[PDB]
């Protein structure tokens, strides 16, 4: 864990060379188009973000501090409807189990029956509590555990052939809100997305997700851009970030524009049968990214050619020509 970094104000966040090397670059081709890009979430590539189900990285302590700030200002970024309480406990079990197994230097879990002892050595937490008993923890169980894991989470109720957004912790969203989307179904909350509905992407995706079983979780990547390493790009806070989209110049693209990638996990929760949706968010400035000349050239092509409805949905319109002009420098054929 490096020294404490900010994702707001002075934006001190930066990636080490190792974090650059493992950044989940999301473009298999020189152009991007939506698809059902799901794969089984099996361990691969030691040291990569795909090695464990939940990835903890050099930014862990910084990110937890950011989460704590968001929640101090707005506790309503976490919601669990009452029928989702068991699912919240399943989520806590899943995270503590995997984190203790995969990062034993940082986390420990010892259990006898419902008498659980969790230690997070990274954050200095030593908690004896009763699994299932919310009066035994300092806050509601989803909140408790997600205050200790990177990325956002949604917990979906599976009923009546569909998935409903009935719980979550959403403090680093790509410009959407849990309080807006609470209780919506799968196709409903995706209503703003261009193109993909007419393509069938959302019909096919719902079908795959409804069939996910215990022990066979699934993953995909999503991406966007963000100006500065701002994690909290929420509707709730738009006045704090939306104007920065007007601040990009030819000389500062490398410092301001960041590639944002979501490594998404979809995993069946064993007691409740709910689906856990992990949204693990990675950020990299374009100065850091263009250290890899293959990334740089591919990014130029993608951004130059991106369909306009998709660029507008993603929020890149305002600075796109500047960005494309800057990236052309790393594409010899261009
Ligand atoms: C339960 C699982 C999922 C949840 C909770 C979720 C949630 C969301 C949310 C809230 C948005 C933002 C919509 C907005 O602008 O207000 C979004 C966008 C998106 N979702 Fe999902 N989603 C899930 C699964 C999937 C899967 C499996 C796909 C497969 C393709 C998918 C494809 C997309 C696409 C293409 C967008 C637009 C993103 C962009 O252009 O950057 N989603 N999703
Ligand atoms: Na293809």
XYZ file of N, CA, C and O in Angstrom, residues 93-279:
748
model
N -20.251 -13.018 3.834
C -19.598 -14.329 3.982
C -18.641 -14.517 2.785
O -17.475 -14.989 2.909
N -19.151 -14.267 1.574
C -18.378 -14.508 0.337
C -17.145 -13.683 0.319
O -16.054 -14.176 0.029
N -17.262 -12.374 0.642
C -16.094 -11.514 0.644
C -15.103 -11.893 1.711
O -13.873 -11.919 1.452
N -15.549 -12.062 2.975
C -14.573 -12.434 3.978
C -13.854 -13.779 3.680
O -12.633 -13.841 3.878
N -14.558 -14.783 3.227
C -13.970 -16.059 2.885
C -12.892 -15.938 1.836
O -11.770 -16.444 2.015
N -13.201 -15.255 0.728
C -12.210 -15.129 -0.332
C -11.084 -14.255 0.036
O -9.901 -14.516 -0.297
N -11.335 -13.116 0.719
C -10.249 -12.258 1.058
C -9.241 -12.931 2.037
O -8.050 -12.744 1.904
N -9.773 -13.634 3.000
C -8.910 -14.376 3.982
C -8.102 -15.499 3.327
O -6.935 -15.718 3.685
N -8.690 -16.175 2.375
C -7.959 -17.204 1.625
C -6.917 -16.604 0.717
O -5.773 -17.060 0.656
N -7.247 -15.534 -0.016
C -6.373 -15.038 -1.085
C -5.319 -14.071 -0.658
O -4.256 -13.937 -1.357
N -5.551 -13.291 0.403
C -4.619 -12.321 0.891
C -4.399 -12.543 2.423
O -4.661 -11.637 3.253
N -3.750 -13.645 2.789
C -3.638 -13.955 4.209
C -2.712 -13.010 4.929
O -2.847 -12.807 6.166
N -1.883 -12.240 4.209
C -1.103 -11.199 4.888
C -1.905 -10.030 5.427
O -1.432 -9.290 6.295
N -3.076 -9.819 4.853
C -3.898 -8.662 5.133
C -5.206 -8.931 5.857
O -5.712 -8.038 6.498
N -5.731 -10.105 5.753
C -7.054 -10.421 6.292
C -7.016 -11.831 6.936
O -6.356 -12.744 6.425
N -7.844 -12.024 7.970
C -7.981 -13.363 8.634
C -9.376 -13.573 9.088
O -10.054 -12.624 9.515
N -9.810 -14.821 9.001
C -11.153 -15.206 9.406
C -11.102 -16.512 10.161
O -10.598 -17.510 9.614
N -11.660 -16.550 11.376
C -11.725 -17.796 12.130
C -13.157 -17.905 12.617
O -13.766 -16.895 12.960
N -13.737 -19.073 12.574
C -15.185 -19.211 12.800
C -15.449 -20.454 13.622
O -14.922 -21.528 13.304
N -16.426 -20.343 14.456
C -17.059 -21.509 15.065
C -18.562 -21.235 15.106
O -19.050 -20.402 15.796
N -19.249 -22.004 14.261
C -20.654 -21.758 14.089
C -20.767 -20.303 13.583
O -20.058 -19.908 12.662
N -21.722 -19.607 14.143
C -22.000 -18.201 13.855
C -21.133 -17.187 14.616
O -21.283 -15.997 14.478
N -20.201 -17.705 15.434
C -19.205 -16.881 16.126
C -17.998 -16.628 15.227
O -17.157 -17.487 15.045
N -17.972 -15.454 14.535
C -16.946 -15.127 13.571
C -15.958 -14.106 14.107
O -16.343 -13.157 14.736
N -14.710 -14.322 13.777
C -13.629 -13.404 14.091
C -12.867 -13.010 12.840
O -12.188 -13.834 12.191
N -13.117 -11.763 12.469
C -12.493 -11.119 11.281
C -11.492 -10.119 11.660
O -11.720 -9.208 12.461
N -10.334 -10.220 11.074
C -9.277 -9.229 11.236
C -8.869 -8.622 9.826
O -8.530 -9.317 8.888
N -8.864 -7.315 9.756
C -8.319 -6.617 8.605
C -7.165 -5.798 9.077
O -7.320 -4.748 9.653
N -6.007 -6.369 8.805
C -4.741 -5.829 9.301
C -4.419 -4.598 8.496
O -3.786 -3.669 8.995
N -4.860 -4.556 7.224
C -4.636 -3.336 6.474
C -5.299 -2.106 7.030
O -4.768 -1.055 6.915
N -6.542 -2.192 7.538
C -7.252 -1.090 8.046
C -7.257 -1.023 9.586
O -7.883 -0.134 10.147
N -6.652 -1.995 10.236
C -6.580 -2.065 11.752
C -7.895 -2.387 12.437
O -8.269 -1.788 13.426
N -8.695 -3.270 11.841
C -9.983 -3.724 12.334
C -9.854 -5.160 12.911
O -9.256 -6.025 12.274
N -10.406 -5.391 14.135
C -10.420 -6.684 14.813
C -11.802 -6.926 15.392
O -12.177 -6.239 16.358
N -12.634 -7.685 14.686
C -14.076 -7.708 14.901
C -14.508 -9.150 15.260
O -14.350 -10.046 14.466
N -15.042 -9.306 16.451
C -15.769 -10.520 16.876
C -17.195 -10.201 16.799
O -17.701 -9.257 17.434
N -17.953 -11.013 16.014
C -19.344 -10.751 15.805
C -20.103 -12.057 15.550
O -19.519 -13.112 15.451
N -21.405 -11.939 15.433
C -22.323 -13.030 15.268
C -22.897 -12.968 13.858
O -23.685 -12.030 13.524
N -22.565 -13.950 13.083
C -23.063 -14.030 11.704
C -24.549 -14.112 11.711
O -25.173 -15.041 12.307
N -25.233 -13.168 11.055
C -26.691 -13.119 11.070
C -27.372 -12.182 12.033
O -28.547 -11.977 11.936
N -26.616 -11.650 13.006
C -27.083 -10.811 14.030
C -26.653 -9.387 13.790
O -25.526 -8.981 14.053
N -27.594 -8.571 13.274
C -27.046 -7.233 12.900
C -26.660 -6.337 14.067
O -25.892 -5.424 13.881
N -27.174 -6.615 15.230
C -26.767 -5.843 16.427
C -25.336 -6.118 16.862
O -24.770 -5.358 17.652
N -24.705 -7.160 16.345
C -23.308 -7.432 16.616
C -22.230 -6.707 15.832
O -21.056 -6.957 16.078
N -22.608 -5.937 14.824
C -21.697 -5.198 14.007
C -22.045 -3.724 14.178
O -23.186 -3.387 14.408
N -21.069 -2.838 13.965
C -21.243 -1.385 14.055
C -22.106 -0.772 12.951
O -22.555 0.381 13.102
N -22.364 -1.526 11.869
C -23.361 -1.103 10.884
C -23.949 -2.299 10.168
O -23.503 -3.444 10.360
N -24.925 -2.019 9.342
C -25.652 -3.037 8.558
C -24.635 -3.894 7.780
O -23.611 -3.353 7.386
N -24.909 -5.184 7.554
C -23.815 -6.075 7.132
C -23.209 -5.783 5.719
O -22.011 -5.919 5.515
N -24.059 -5.310 4.792
C -23.536 -5.043 3.415
C -22.583 -3.859 3.552
O -21.460 -3.910 3.009
N -23.020 -2.826 4.245
C -22.208 -1.663 4.497
C -20.889 -1.958 5.193
O -19.802 -1.502 4.834
N -20.986 -2.842 6.202
C -19.825 -3.280 6.997
C -18.681 -3.835 6.145
O -17.552 -3.456 6.258
N -19.026 -4.773 5.271
C -18.038 -5.503 4.521
C -17.610 -4.683 3.305
O -16.434 -4.687 2.960
N -18.534 -3.917 2.706
C -18.108 -3.190 1.464
C -17.290 -1.944 1.800
O -16.531 -1.430 0.992
N -17.376 -1.466 3.029
C -16.435 -0.462 3.535
C -15.027 -1.015 3.593
O -14.109 -0.283 3.909
N -14.878 -2.305 3.336
C -13.586 -2.968 3.368
C -13.180 -3.704 2.089
O -12.251 -4.555 2.064
N -13.886 -3.446 0.993
C -13.504 -4.067 -0.290
C -13.611 -3.020 -1.432
O -14.570 -2.196 -1.464
N -12.631 -3.019 -2.318
C -12.658 -2.109 -3.475
C -13.808 -2.370 -4.463
O -14.291 -3.492 -4.569
N -14.191 -1.302 -5.153
C -15.266 -1.372 -6.175
C -16.655 -1.268 -5.565
O -16.860 -1.282 -4.298
N -17.625 -1.138 -6.427
C -18.973 -1.066 -6.061
C -19.618 -2.486 -6.097
O -19.067 -3.417 -6.674
N -20.814 -2.588 -5.507
C -21.602 -3.858 -5.498
C -23.062 -3.570 -5.691
O -23.645 -2.676 -5.069
N -23.747 -4.345 -6.530
C -25.161 -4.423 -6.503
C -25.567 -5.833 -6.144
O -24.818 -6.803 -6.432
N -26.687 -5.944 -5.428
C -27.207 -7.296 -5.000
C -28.587 -7.414 -5.605
O -29.507 -6.617 -5.292
N -28.790 -8.359 -6.514
C -30.001 -8.411 -7.230
C -30.913 -9.590 -6.742
O -30.410 -10.732 -6.589
N -32.192 -9.290 -6.582
C -33.191 -10.297 -6.245
C -33.572 -10.948 -7.598
O -33.982 -10.237 -8.528
N -33.499 -12.289 -7.658
C -33.974 -13.029 -8.844
C -35.361 -13.585 -8.604
O -35.542 -14.407 -7.697
N -36.310 -13.043 -9.302
C -37.740 -13.441 -9.136
C -38.477 -13.266 -10.422
O -38.236 -12.348 -11.237
N -39.463 -14.145 -10.654
C -40.350 -13.919 -11.785
C -39.614 -13.749 -13.139
O -40.005 -12.940 -13.919
N -38.580 -14.501 -13.389
C -37.841 -14.437 -14.627
C -36.972 -13.211 -14.835
O -36.649 -12.858 -15.961
N -36.652 -12.489 -13.753
C -35.945 -11.174 -13.973
C -35.034 -10.945 -12.724
O -35.029 -11.703 -11.705
N -34.282 -9.850 -12.806
C -33.366 -9.417 -11.728
C -33.746 -7.988 -11.332
O -34.032 -7.103 -12.206
N -33.772 -7.707 -9.999
C -34.251 -6.446 -9.503
C -33.182 -5.878 -8.554
O -32.617 -6.622 -7.683
N -32.853 -4.617 -8.744
C -31.807 -3.935 -8.004
C -32.237 -3.490 -6.604
O -32.657 -2.362 -6.350
N -32.210 -4.483 -5.702
C -32.900 -4.330 -4.385
C -31.935 -4.050 -3.221
O -32.344 -3.819 -2.111
N -30.667 -4.043 -3.526
C -29.591 -3.665 -2.557
C -28.287 -3.275 -3.244
O -28.072 -3.654 -4.418
N -27.455 -2.469 -2.585
C -26.143 -2.261 -3.081
C -25.332 -1.207 -2.273
O -25.856 -0.632 -1.355
N -24.091 -1.102 -2.673
C -23.149 -0.067 -2.233
C -22.548 0.540 -3.470
O -21.766 -0.079 -4.151
N -22.956 1.772 -3.768
C -22.574 2.433 -5.058
C -22.040 3.847 -4.716
O -22.765 4.858 -4.688
N -20.761 3.868 -4.540
C -20.033 5.094 -4.254
C -19.046 5.532 -5.348
O -18.484 6.655 -5.193
N -18.744 4.657 -6.304
C -17.900 5.024 -7.459
C -18.564 4.761 -8.826
O -17.913 4.180 -9.697
N -19.771 5.259 -9.031
C -20.510 4.837 -10.252
C -19.989 5.618 -11.482
O -19.534 6.769 -11.312
N -20.115 5.001 -12.679
C -19.981 5.726 -13.946
C -21.301 6.419 -14.268
O -22.088 5.945 -15.144
N -21.620 7.490 -13.542
C -22.704 8.383 -13.829
C -24.078 7.692 -13.843
O -24.932 7.819 -14.744
N -24.413 7.026 -12.681
C -25.720 6.550 -12.417
C -25.823 6.479 -10.841
O -24.801 6.738 -10.169
N -26.984 6.138 -10.362
C -27.324 6.158 -8.942
C -28.151 5.004 -8.492
O -29.176 4.682 -9.062
N -27.767 4.427 -7.355
C -28.549 3.385 -6.732
C -29.889 3.844 -6.220
O -30.920 3.153 -6.375
N -29.922 5.042 -5.658
C -31.217 5.550 -5.239
C -32.170 5.815 -6.412
O -33.352 5.533 -6.267
N -31.668 6.200 -7.590
C -32.532 6.224 -8.748
C -33.054 4.859 -9.218
O -34.218 4.709 -9.622
N -32.143 3.879 -9.181
C -32.380 2.605 -9.814
C -32.966 1.523 -8.876
O -33.378 0.422 -9.323
N -33.062 1.866 -7.612
C -33.535 0.928 -6.607
C -34.876 0.313 -6.984
O -35.873 1.043 -7.279
N -34.929 -1.009 -6.968
C -36.206 -1.699 -7.306
C -36.450 -1.911 -8.761
O -37.400 -2.683 -9.172
N -35.675 -1.287 -9.661
C -35.848 -1.553 -11.109
C -35.422 -2.933 -11.564
O -34.594 -3.584 -10.891
N -35.977 -3.406 -12.704
C -35.579 -4.644 -13.281
C -34.456 -4.409 -14.296
O -34.177 -3.252 -14.708
N -33.876 -5.488 -14.742
C -32.660 -5.515 -15.613
C -32.782 -4.615 -16.876
O -31.932 -3.786 -17.143
N -33.827 -4.826 -17.657
C -33.944 -4.031 -18.910
C -34.296 -2.628 -18.595
O -33.880 -1.725 -19.310
N -35.060 -2.409 -17.508
C -35.422 -1.066 -17.049
C -34.268 -0.166 -16.687
O -34.161 1.010 -17.214
N -33.385 -0.652 -15.841
C -32.257 0.229 -15.422
C -31.287 0.452 -16.599
O -30.508 1.389 -16.603
N -31.336 -0.417 -17.650
C -30.479 -0.265 -18.813
C -31.107 0.584 -19.873
O -30.502 0.737 -20.959
N -32.282 1.106 -19.610
C -33.047 1.932 -20.610
C -32.273 3.089 -21.302
O -32.412 3.309 -22.530
N -31.355 3.776 -20.605
C -30.590 4.835 -21.288
C -29.533 4.425 -22.301
O -29.011 5.317 -23.024
N -29.155 3.158 -22.366
C -28.006 2.710 -23.141
C -28.444 2.640 -24.640
O -29.484 1.962 -24.969
N -27.714 3.335 -25.500
C -27.978 3.211 -26.976
C -27.607 1.961 -27.604
O -26.746 1.182 -27.133
N -28.348 1.614 -28.671
C -27.974 0.458 -29.513
C -28.158 -0.951 -29.020
O -28.618 -1.881 -29.774
N -27.759 -1.213 -27.780
C -27.627 -2.531 -27.284
C -29.000 -3.261 -27.161
O -29.057 -4.452 -27.174
N -30.045 -2.524 -26.909
C -31.392 -3.180 -26.767
C -31.775 -3.776 -28.118
O -32.176 -4.953 -28.178
N -31.737 -2.939 -29.147
C -32.131 -3.435 -30.539
C -31.238 -4.576 -31.041
O -31.709 -5.554 -31.713
N -29.976 -4.601 -30.612
C -29.089 -5.694 -30.855
C -29.363 -7.037 -30.177
O -28.708 -8.024 -30.511
N -30.208 -7.010 -29.131
C -30.471 -8.178 -28.320
C -29.512 -8.389 -27.171
O -29.600 -9.412 -26.505
N -28.589 -7.448 -26.911
C -27.489 -7.689 -26.014
C -28.128 -7.936 -24.624
O -27.688 -8.831 -23.865
N -29.074 -7.091 -24.327
C -29.705 -7.123 -22.926
C -30.626 -8.337 -22.762
O -30.584 -9.024 -21.736
N -31.249 -8.751 -23.843
C -32.075 -10.024 -23.804
C -31.154 -11.183 -23.560
O -31.424 -12.036 -22.665
N -30.061 -11.356 -24.322
C -29.209 -12.463 -24.169
C -28.460 -12.442 -22.794
O -28.287 -13.492 -22.168
N -28.036 -11.230 -22.391
C -27.298 -11.100 -21.149
C -28.187 -11.564 -19.960
O -27.712 -12.288 -19.109
N -29.442 -11.148 -19.936
C -30.363 -11.508 -18.822
C -30.499 -13.015 -18.774
O -30.368 -13.642 -17.711
N -30.690 -13.619 -19.939
C -30.719 -15.064 -19.959
C -29.573 -15.812 -19.408
O -29.791 -16.734 -18.625
N -28.331 -15.403 -19.679
C -27.116 -16.001 -19.189
C -27.106 -15.792 -17.644
O -26.795 -16.740 -16.924
N -27.344 -14.554 -17.233
C -27.261 -14.171 -15.769
C -28.303 -15.019 -14.934
O -27.949 -15.504 -13.819
N -29.511 -15.156 -15.430
C -30.520 -15.949 -14.718
C -30.084 -17.406 -14.459
O -30.467 -18.018 -13.419
N -29.148 -17.902 -15.269
C -28.680 -19.284 -15.158
C -27.405 -19.485 -14.442
O -26.875 -20.629 -14.355
N -26.819 -18.416 -13.875
C -25.654 -18.570 -13.138
C -25.866 -19.387 -11.876
O -26.752 -19.153 -11.132
N -25.003 -20.379 -11.731
C -25.019 -21.271 -10.526
C -23.893 -21.051 -9.551
O -22.775 -20.560 -9.880
N -24.159 -21.493 -8.295
C -23.121 -21.501 -7.290
C -21.899 -22.221 -7.781
O -22.021 -23.237 -8.444
N -20.752 -21.613 -7.581
C -19.520 -22.175 -7.987
C -19.142 -21.928 -9.438
O -18.088 -22.337 -9.879
N -20.014 -21.343 -10.231
C -19.660 -21.035 -11.620
C -19.911 -19.515 -11.933
O -20.678 -19.196 -12.794
N -19.182 -18.632 -11.236
C -19.362 -17.250 -11.516
C -18.821 -16.822 -12.943
O -18.088 -17.581 -13.597
N -19.161 -15.598 -13.356
C -19.030 -15.132 -14.712
C -18.469 -13.702 -14.582
O -18.638 -13.092 -13.522
N -17.761 -13.201 -15.609
C -17.174 -11.867 -15.591
C -17.223 -11.235 -16.967
O -17.423 -11.922 -17.938
N -17.137 -9.903 -16.986
C -16.925 -9.151 -18.188
C -16.216 -7.792 -17.855
O -16.179 -7.417 -16.700
N -15.787 -7.087 -18.901
C -15.268 -5.720 -18.745
C -16.206 -4.739 -19.353
O -16.880 -4.936 -20.390
N -16.357 -3.600 -18.666
C -16.943 -2.383 -19.208
C -15.874 -1.271 -19.086
O -14.825 -1.436 -18.393
N -16.048 -0.213 -19.857
C -15.093 0.912 -19.821
C -15.815 2.207 -20.079
O -16.931 2.274 -20.644
N -15.139 3.318 -19.709
C -15.434 4.683 -20.101
C -14.174 5.541 -19.885
O -13.097 4.984 -19.737
N -14.342 6.867 -20.063
C -13.309 7.800 -19.685
C -13.825 8.686 -18.552
O -15.078 8.943 -18.354
N -12.808 9.212 -17.756
C -13.121 10.123 -16.701
C -12.036 11.181 -16.715
O -10.899 10.874 -16.935
N -12.476 12.411 -16.563
C -11.513 13.536 -16.424
C -11.060 13.648 -14.942
O -11.970 13.833 -14.117
N -9.760 13.560 -14.727
C -9.100 13.392 -13.425
C -9.436 11.974 -12.835
O -10.409 11.307 -13.352
N -8.632 11.480 -11.875
C -8.962 10.184 -11.323
C -10.142 10.292 -10.295
O -9.916 10.061 -9.085
N -11.306 10.749 -10.731
C -12.434 10.919 -9.863
C -13.231 9.589 -9.794
O -13.878 9.245 -10.785
N -13.351 8.992 -8.613
C -14.137 7.801 -8.490
C -15.599 8.118 -8.370
O -16.431 7.397 -8.957
N -15.974 9.186 -7.651
C -17.332 9.454 -7.374
C -17.954 10.317 -8.541
O -18.300 11.474 -8.306
N -18.119 9.715 -9.717
C -18.794 10.403 -10.863
C -20.280 10.140 -10.852
O -20.839 9.567 -11.804
N -20.943 10.549 -9.742
C -22.336 10.309 -9.520
C -23.223 11.446 -9.953
O -22.780 12.669 -9.778
N -24.446 11.198 -10.331
C -25.438 12.308 -10.455
C -25.500 13.195 -9.210
O -25.590 14.452 -9.290
N -25.440 12.594 -7.999
C -25.568 13.309 -6.760
C -24.540 14.428 -6.594
O -24.791 15.453 -5.965
N -23.401 14.265 -7.225
C -22.280 15.174 -7.054
C -21.884 15.891 -8.358
O -20.722 16.339 -8.476
N -22.781 15.874 -9.386
C -22.428 16.412 -10.716
C -21.733 17.778 -10.677
O -20.742 17.995 -11.411
N -22.215 18.704 -9.856
C -21.551 20.017 -9.831
C -20.094 19.979 -9.502
O -19.353 20.928 -9.854
N -19.610 18.954 -8.816
C -18.219 18.774 -8.533
C -17.312 18.222 -9.592
O -16.084 18.323 -9.500
N -17.863 17.588 -10.629
C -17.073 16.943 -11.632
C -17.468 17.245 -13.104
O -16.574 17.126 -13.977
N -18.745 17.571 -13.388
C -19.292 17.618 -14.760
C -18.599 18.707 -15.524
O -18.247 18.487 -16.668
N -18.266 19.809 -14.848
C -17.538 20.905 -15.553
C -16.111 20.611 -15.989
O -15.601 21.330 -16.917
N -15.435 19.617 -15.419
C -14.099 19.340 -15.789
C -14.025 18.802 -17.242
O -12.927 18.694 -17.767
N -15.178 18.372 -17.769
C -15.211 17.868 -19.129
C -14.940 18.994 -20.122
O -14.702 18.693 -21.323
N -14.991 20.222 -19.615
C -14.732 21.474 -20.441
C -13.286 21.955 -20.337
O -12.937 22.974 -20.969
N -12.446 21.286 -19.581
C -11.073 21.719 -19.215
C -9.919 21.053 -19.953
O -8.771 21.329 -19.625
N -10.195 20.204 -20.929
C -9.202 19.449 -21.598
C -8.643 20.337 -22.779
O -9.462 20.899 -23.486
N -7.327 20.306 -22.869
C -6.574 21.032 -23.908
C -5.615 20.092 -24.505
O -5.137 19.074 -23.992
N -5.109 20.517 -25.725
C -4.032 19.768 -26.284
C -2.850 19.483 -25.425
O -2.124 18.459 -25.583
N -2.503 20.421 -24.509
C -1.321 20.216 -23.720
C -1.582 19.348 -22.451
O -0.640 18.763 -21.921
N -2.851 19.252 -22.010
C -3.056 18.547 -20.701
C -3.820 17.209 -20.836
O -4.146 16.570 -19.813
N -4.078 16.770 -22.086
C -4.804 15.457 -22.236
C -4.188 14.310 -21.398
O -4.939 13.544 -20.703
N -2.837 14.128 -21.391
C -2.144 13.050 -20.736
C -2.329 13.023 -19.169
O -2.331 11.924 -18.577
N -2.534 14.241 -18.622
C -2.711 14.423 -17.183
C -4.148 14.309 -16.769
O -4.432 13.855 -15.674
N -5.061 14.763 -17.589
C -6.516 14.875 -17.226
C -7.300 13.601 -17.646
O -8.155 13.054 -16.837
N -7.126 13.148 -18.892
C -8.005 12.061 -19.363
C -7.536 10.762 -18.770
O -6.346 10.412 -18.827
N -8.454 10.007 -18.134
C -8.167 8.716 -17.622
C -9.065 7.654 -18.291
O -10.257 7.945 -18.504
N -8.482 6.537 -18.573
C -9.283 5.356 -19.006
C -9.800 4.730 -17.699
O -9.006 4.423 -16.794
N -11.085 4.414 -17.687
C -11.774 3.809 -16.526
C -12.297 2.452 -16.973
O -13.039 2.381 -17.940
N -11.868 1.391 -16.295
C -12.359 0.041 -16.621
C -13.014 -0.586 -15.416
O -12.489 -0.540 -14.250
N -14.138 -1.224 -15.699
C -14.877 -2.006 -14.676
C -14.650 -3.463 -14.956
O -15.081 -4.029 -15.999
N -14.038 -4.154 -14.018
C -14.031 -5.627 -14.009
C -15.199 -6.116 -13.228
O -15.240 -5.868 -11.992
N -16.167 -6.731 -13.908
C -17.436 -7.091 -13.313
C -17.479 -8.576 -12.998
O -17.082 -9.431 -13.822
N -17.990 -8.903 -11.807
C -18.205 -10.285 -11.325
C -19.661 -10.455 -11.118
O -20.332 -9.629 -10.539
N -20.219 -11.541 -11.635
C -21.541 -11.982 -11.346
C -21.481 -13.425 -10.742
O -21.015 -14.417 -11.372
N -21.949 -13.501 -9.502
C -21.770 -14.717 -8.655
C -23.073 -14.963 -7.896
O -23.631 -14.080 -7.278
N -23.549 -16.227 -7.876
C -24.762 -16.624 -7.192
C -24.471 -16.740 -5.674
O -23.469 -17.371 -5.275
N -25.264 -16.081 -4.911
C -25.160 -16.119 -3.406
C -25.913 -17.355 -2.889
O -27.068 -17.523 -3.165
N -25.192 -18.233 -2.140
C -25.700 -19.621 -1.903
C -26.943 -19.749 -0.992
O -27.761 -20.577 -1.277
N -27.089 -18.968 0.072
C -28.297 -19.131 0.938
C -29.501 -18.465 0.285
O -30.538 -19.085 0.089
N -29.356 -17.194 -0.096
C -30.472 -16.390 -0.625
C -30.860 -16.648 -2.145
O -31.917 -16.304 -2.549
N -29.947 -17.169 -2.899
C -30.077 -17.347 -4.354
C -30.086 -15.990 -5.094
O -30.491 -15.928 -6.250
N -29.756 -14.927 -4.414
C -29.587 -13.586 -5.069
C -28.315 -13.635 -5.933
O -27.466 -14.584 -5.848
N -28.140 -12.621 -6.824
C -26.886 -12.501 -7.629
C -26.071 -11.322 -7.161
O -26.647 -10.202 -7.004
N -24.822 -11.553 -6.878
C -23.915 -10.476 -6.484
C -23.297 -9.926 -7.829
O -22.854 -10.673 -8.689
N -23.331 -8.613 -8.002
C -22.669 -7.915 -9.128
C -21.589 -6.987 -8.588
O -21.915 -6.002 -7.929
N -20.334 -7.414 -8.728
C -19.170 -6.626 -8.310
C -18.751 -5.749 -9.460
O -18.600 -6.239 -10.567
N -18.445 -4.487 -9.167
C -17.992 -3.543 -10.129
C -16.638 -2.956 -9.699
O -16.553 -1.858 -9.006
